[PDB]
Design an enzyme around this catalytic site. Structure first.
Site, PDB file in Angstrom:
ATOM      1  N   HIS A  41     -22.496  28.514  11.385  1.00 12.69           N
ATOM      2  CA  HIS A  41     -21.308  28.981  10.695  1.00 12.69           C
ATOM      3  C   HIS A  41     -20.433  29.871  11.570  1.00 12.69           C
ATOM      4  O   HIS A  41     -19.406  30.365  11.087  1.00 12.69           O
ATOM      5  CB  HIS A  41     -21.645  29.703   9.389  1.00 12.69           C
ATOM      6  CG  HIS A  41     -22.231  31.070   9.555  1.00 12.69           C
ATOM      7  ND1 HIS A  41     -23.574  31.320   9.382  1.00 12.69           N
ATOM      8  CD2 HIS A  41     -21.654  32.268   9.810  1.00 12.69           C
ATOM      9  CE1 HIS A  41     -23.805  32.610   9.546  1.00 12.69           C
ATOM     10  NE2 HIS A  41     -22.657  33.208   9.813  1.00 12.69           N
ATOM     11  N   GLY A 143     -22.468  40.732  11.064  1.00 12.75           N
ATOM     12  CA  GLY A 143     -22.719  40.640  12.481  1.00 12.75           C
ATOM     13  C   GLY A 143     -24.165  40.401  12.848  1.00 12.75           C
ATOM     14  O   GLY A 143     -24.453  40.129  14.022  1.00 12.75           O
ATOM     15  N   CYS A 145     -26.170  37.953  11.899  1.00 11.37           N
ATOM     16  CA  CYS A 145     -26.612  36.566  11.935  1.00 11.37           C
ATOM     17  C   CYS A 145     -26.968  36.158  13.358  1.00 11.37           C
ATOM     18  O   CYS A 145     -26.348  36.585  14.331  1.00 11.37           O
ATOM     19  CB  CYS A 145     -25.530  35.657  11.356  1.00 11.37           C
ATOM     20  SG  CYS A 145     -25.422  35.855   9.556  1.00 11.37           S
TER      21      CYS A 145
END
Ligand SMILES: *[C@H](O)[C@H](CC(C)C)NC(=O)[C@H](CC(C)C)NC(=O)[C@H](CC(C)C)NC(=O)OCc1ccccc1
Ligand SMILES: *[C@H](O)[C@H](CC(C)C)NC(=O)[C@H](CC(C)C)NC(=O)[C@H](CC(C)C)NC(=O)OCc1ccccc1
Ligand SMILES: [Cl-]
Lengths: 305, 302
Positions: A41, A143, A145
Site C-alpha cells: 500500500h 509510519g 508499516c
C-alpha cells in the site's frame, strides 16, 4: 531468577531495515540480499485507499519511483514485482548485513518479537503473540508499516510478520513475508472487524509453571482434574480447549517442576472460578497468555543466540 | 495506537558484549574501545565469597588469569585494574563495533533497557525501572552478571547499569559503569535487604495519560484534589510523594490531553480507594509505574 516479557536481541534485524518512499507515502522495508520487501500500500494514493487496483497501480509505476535508503545510503531499485500484499523491489546492492534467515508463517498462540521502526530507523522492540483471531496487540503509529516480527534460533532469523494496519480496538493486522495476511483482512480501508479473542490456555499454564520456577507457589493446591472437566470450565471463560498436543508440549515444564499438567490445570480452574483474591502472579493481576512453553524454558534456562 | 513495555533496539550493545572467565567463574564484560568492564567479583573463589577482600584477591592475579572471549575471538589482556566495584581489563584490540556512548547515572523512577547475556552472548532484551529502593525487577540467572542496562539517545548509547547480584524476592542490584552501586548494597554474600518497595507515583500518572491517549478514559471523573490531599492518600498506599517538580514534568501530557494534573491525581486517588471494579487500563489490572513521562511521549509520538 525473575520472569519478564522478553524480546529477542534485534541487532540482526536492525541491519536489514530500510526506508521506502513512493511519492508522499513513506514506510519501512526489509532489505535481504538484493531485494527489499515492503507493504504494497506504499503505492496507494490519498483518494484511492478504499478500492485500490494494486495490479494496475504497480504496472504503471517504474523502478525510480521507489526511493529506498540504508539510513544515509540511497539504494537504486532495478526491478519491482508484487507478491500478494507485499512488494519485492530488486536493488543493485546486496545487503552486506543479510543474516541467515527464513520466512515462516506462525500459528495462533505462538509468539515473536516486533522491531518497531519509523523512516527505516528502528525505534523499539517488544514481544507479541498471534492471537487466536489472527491479530496482535502491538504498539504501532503512522509510519510503522513494514516493521517486521521475528524469532531467532541458533543463528537463523525466522521472519514471520510484516505490519500493515490497525483495526478499531487498537489491534493490529499484517502479513507473513509471502505477503498473505494473517486472518481474513485485506489492505483496504473498508470496514473490517476482528473475531473472538479467546485466551491461549496452553500459554497461561506455561506462565504458571514460570511462576512456580521463580518462587510464586500460592496458587498450587491439592486437587486434580480430568482434562474433560478442566475443558468444561475453560469453555465458560472463553479459553481455548486444552488438547493432548498441549499437554505434550507442557511436559518438560511439568517434569522440571514436579507438578503434573492436570494438577496445574486444577490450579488454573480454581483461579478462573475464584480469581486471585487480591494476590498477584509474577507481578500481574491477570492470567498472562503471551508466553509459550518454549518461551518459558528459553528464558529460565538462559539460552543465547 | 497501542501501548507496550518497549525496549530500545539492542544491536549497538550486542557488538560490545564479551565473555570473561577467571578461575571457574564466568560472566559478561562490556568491550568499549580497548577496555573491557566487568564486575570485580569475577575474581572471588568459591570458598571466599562471604567477605572477600578484593585488594588481597588481586595480589595474586596476572593478566593471563583473565580469559576474555569476543564470540570465538580471543582477546589478549595487557593490563588490569580495579575501579570501585568493576575491573577494567586493557586488551590489545580496540572494539571495532564500539558505538558513540556515555556513562550516565540514573535516578529512581527512570527507565532503561537491559540486554541479558550469558557467556558473552545475548539472551533477550527488556525494559526496567530503577525502583525507589534502588533495585530493579529483571530476569537474571547465574552467569548474567556484567549484563548492562542502557538508553539510546539519537546516535548515543547511554550505559547506566551493570548487573552484579540478586537479593531474595528475585530482586536485582548492580552498579553504574563507573562501578558504584545503586543503593546501599555491597558485592558480598553477606545478608542484605532492599528497603520496602514503593510505587513511582509520577510514572503511574504518566501511564494514566498514555491510557487516555490510547482511548481508555473510564477512570476520569469530575473530582479534583490538592497536591497535599493527594499525598495523604499516596502515603497510605505506599506511593512515593508527588512533588511540584513532578507536576511540572507531567505538564506536557496534561496539555496534550486537556486533563489537568491534579484532575488525573483525583482519578488516581479514586482508583487507589476503589480499585478498578473488574476493569482494565491498557491491558492491565494493576496500576503500572515503569513508564516515565518521557517514555509515554516517545511511544505515543515518535
Ligand atoms: C501503515 O504505516 C499504517 C499503520 C497504522 C498503525 C495506521 N496503516 C495504514 O495506514 C493502513 C493503510 C491501508 C491502505 C492498508 N490503514 C489502516 O490501518 C486504517 C487506519 C484507520 C485507523 C483509519 N485502518 C483500516 O483501514 O481498517 C479497516 C477499517 C476501515 C473502516 C472502519 C473499520 C475498519
Ligand atoms: C552473577 O552472575 C550473579 C547473578 C545472580 C542473579 C546469581 N551474582 C552473584 O553470583 C553474586 C556474587 C556476589 C559475590 C556479589 N551473589 C549474589 O547475587 C547472591 C546470590 C544468592 C543466590 C546467594 N546474593 C547475595 O549474596 O545477596 C546478599 C544476601 C546474602 C545472604 C543472605 C541474604 C542476602
Ligand atoms: Cl495486571
Amino acid at each position: 531468577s525473575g520472569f519478564r516479557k522478553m524480546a529477542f536481541p534485534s541487532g540482526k534485524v536492525e541491519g536489514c531495515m530500510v526506508q521506502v518512499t513512493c511519492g508522499t507515502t513513506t514506510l519501512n522495508g526489509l532489505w535481504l540480499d538484493d531485494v527489499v520487501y515492503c507493504p504494497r500500500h506504499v503505492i496507494c494514493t490519498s483518494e484511492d485507499m478504499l478500492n485500490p487496483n494494486y495490479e494496475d497501480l504497480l504496472i504503471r509505476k517504474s523502478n525510480h519511483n521507489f526511493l529506498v535508503q540504508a539510513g544515509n545510503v540511497q539504494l537504486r531499485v532495478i526491478g519491482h514485482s508484487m507478491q500478494n500484499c507485499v512488494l519485492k523491489l530488486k536493488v543493485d546492492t546486496a545487503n552486506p548485513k543479510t543474516p541467515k534467515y527464513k520466512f515462516v508463517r506462525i500459528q495462533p498462540g505462538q509468539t515473536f518479537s516486533v522491531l518497531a521502526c519509523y523512516n527505516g530507523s528502528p525505534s523499539g522492540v517488544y514481544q507479541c503473540a498471534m492471537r487466536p483471531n489472527f491479530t496482535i496487540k502491538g504498539s504501532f503509529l503512522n509510519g510503522s508499516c513494514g516493521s517486521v516480527g521475528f524469532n531467532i534460533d541458533y543463528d537463523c532469523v525466522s521472519f514471520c510478520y510484516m505490519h500493515h494496519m490497525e483495526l478499531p480496538t487498537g489491534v493490529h493486522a499484517g502479513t507473513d513475508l509471502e505477503g498473505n495476511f494473517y486472518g481474513p483482512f485485506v489492505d483496504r480501508q473498508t470496514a473490517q472487524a476482528a473475531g473472538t479473542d479467546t485466551t491461549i490456555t496452553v500459554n497461561v499454564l506455561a506462565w504458571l509453571y514460570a511462576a512456580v520456577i521463580n518462587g510464586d507457589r500460592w496458587f498450587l493446591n491439592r486437587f486434580t482434574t480430568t482434562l474433560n472437566d478442566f475443558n468444561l470450565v475453560a469453555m465458560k471463560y472463553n479459553y481455548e480447549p486444552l488438547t493432548q498436543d498441549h499437554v505434550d508440549i507442557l511436559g518438560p515444564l511439568s517434569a522440571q517442576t514436579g507438578i503434573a499438567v492436570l494438577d496445574m490445570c486444577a490450579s488454573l480452574k480454581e483461579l478462573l472460578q475464584n480469581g486471585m483474591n487480591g494476590r498477584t502472579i509474577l507481578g500481574s493481576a491477570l492470567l498472562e497468555d503471551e508466553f509459550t512453553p518454549f518461551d518459558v524454558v528459553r528464558q529460565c534456562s538462559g539460552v543465547t543466540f
